[PDB]
């Protein structure tokens, strides 16, 4: 009594989750090595004591809080400011 010439979708595919975005926040203690932001292309720019990996990952180079800075047309930056 039922089904007839049922159209098959050409899609229904999908990507994995990349779990990207910002991982550490301003005024958050970090140590050297930590990852501060995962991204795909500097939405965030490598500040002082902040390095950038082969996929545009942004990791701390020394300890003490992260800190976000917004230099308008130049770019968004994040640096780490060492201990005390």
């Amino acid at each position: 009594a039922h089904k007839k010439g049922l159209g098959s979708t050409r899609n229904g595919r999908d990507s994995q989750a990349k779990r990207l975005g910002v991982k550490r926040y301003e005024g958050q203690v970090v140590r050297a090595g930590n990852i501060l932001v995962r991204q795909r292309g500097t939405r965030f720019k490598p500040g002082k004591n902040v390095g950038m990996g082969r996929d545009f990952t942004l990791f701390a180079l020394v300890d003490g809080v992260v800190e976000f800075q917004d230099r308008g047309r130049l770019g968004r930056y994040v640096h780490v400011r060492p201990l005390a």
């Binding site: 039922h2 089904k3 007839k4 049922l6 159209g7 979708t9």
Partner: protein
Amino acid sequence: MLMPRRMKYRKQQRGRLKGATKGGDYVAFGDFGLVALEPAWITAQQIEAARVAMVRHFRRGGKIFIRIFPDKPYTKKPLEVRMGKGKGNVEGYVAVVKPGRVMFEVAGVTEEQAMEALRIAGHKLPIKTKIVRRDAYDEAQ
């Protein structure tokens, strides 16, 4: 019939119709007008039947302004199929009106010749409607 002459995407989602319109709640071309009192989708089928209605009212003469366009794909699953196995094929095209949005305007037409006109065109519509004339509130807008 009022179909989009080129299309970025095929089928398109439903989306609910919360609230008042986004624009065109004030007349801007014609002297009088027709407006939504209640939200719906309007078929190209409907729209064209309202146009043709008025056009036949002042046979030979008058100019009709119509301020909504069927840009949404009204999809629909074929007859007697079960759920799934994809989305319906696109059966029609509809336009999203919310309350306040102006649909039909006229110019070069008498008073009642645009009352009776925009009356009947109201009747070829799935919704309660008000007719309102151009006003300063529209000029200030």
